[PDB]
From a paper:
PrimPol is a member of the archaeo-eukaryotic primase (AEP) superfamily, whose members fulfil a range of roles in DNA replication, repair and damage tolerance, and it possesses both primase and TLS polymerase activities. Evidence is accumulating that suggests the primary role of PrimPol in vivo is to reprime DNA replication downstream of DNA damage lesions and secondary structures. Comparison of the RBM-A and RBM-B structures reveals that the peptides adopt almost identical helical conformations that occupy the basic cleft in a similar fashion.
To determine the molecular basis for binding of PrimPol RBM-A to RPA70N, in the wider context of the whole RBD, we co-crystallized a complex of PrimPol480–560 bound to RPA70NE7R. Again, co-crystals contained a 1:1 molar ratio in an orthorhombic P212121 crystal lattice. Surprisingly, model building and density refinement revealed that RPA70N bound to PrimPol residues 546–560 rather than RMB-A. An excellent fit to the high-resolution (1.28 Å) electron density is evident for amino acids 548–556, despite residues 480–547 not being visible in the area of contiguous electron density. The crystal structure revealed that the second RBM, termed RBM-B, also binds to the basic cleft of RPA70N. Like RBM-A, RBM-B has a low pI (pI=3.25) but this motif contains two adjacent Asp-Glu motifs instead of the typical di-Asp motif, not previously identified in the RPA70N binding motifs of other RPA partner proteins. The orientation of the RBM-B helix is stabilized by a number of electrostatic interactions. The aspartate at position 551 of PrimPol is perhaps the most important point of contact as it interacts with the two arginines of RPA70N (R31 and R43) and a threonine (T34) side chain, as well as the backbone amide N-H of T34. The glutamate at position 548 forms an electrostatic interaction with an arginine (R91) on the other side of RPA70N's β-barrel, acting to secure the helix of PrimPol in this orientation.
Residue numbers in the entry:
A (entry chain X): 0 to 8
B (entry chain A): 0 to 120
Write the structure that this text describes.
């Protein structure tokens, strides 16, 4: 649900 | 009673109480790479405690060999020995798996255990 671009921040 | 092998309620405990002392036993439902640039690959997991699934698990990169050598894969059952929670600016929480042990391989388990439903964060 959390997109890849946000999950690693 | 295969669901008796999983730490039912651990996902709620992590996401509601911030309990990081538990060493819960969870099932991997799916693993996929996260989009990355010029860096080590990163993996995200959909995990189950038997009652809920949660898609916001991320593997510490030190554990990447477990995925790449196919010991940690969909359907396996694993005990989480060390994890941390990180909260994003938007409020959603990520669970970073730092140490885990595979208790039963995907091939020995074979199926998704029980009927877990997505956790409502």
């Amino acid at each position: 649900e959390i997109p890849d671009e946000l999950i690693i921040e | 009673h295969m669901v008796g092998q999983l730490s039912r309620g651990a996902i709620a405990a992590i996401m509601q109480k911030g309990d990081t002392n538990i060493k819960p036993i969870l099932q991997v439902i799916n693993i996929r790479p996260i989009t990355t640039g010029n860096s080590p690959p990163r993996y995200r997991l959909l995990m189950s405690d038997g009652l809920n699934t949660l898609s916001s698990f991320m593997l510490a990169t030190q554990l990447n060999p477990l995925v790449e050598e196919e010991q940690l894969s969909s359907n396996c059952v694993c005990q989480i020995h060390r994890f941390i929670v990180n909260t994003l600016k938007d409020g959603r929480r990520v669970v970073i798996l730092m140490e885990l042990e595979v208790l039963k391989s995907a091939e020995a388990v074979g199926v998704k255990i029980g009927n877990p439903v997505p956790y409502n964060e």
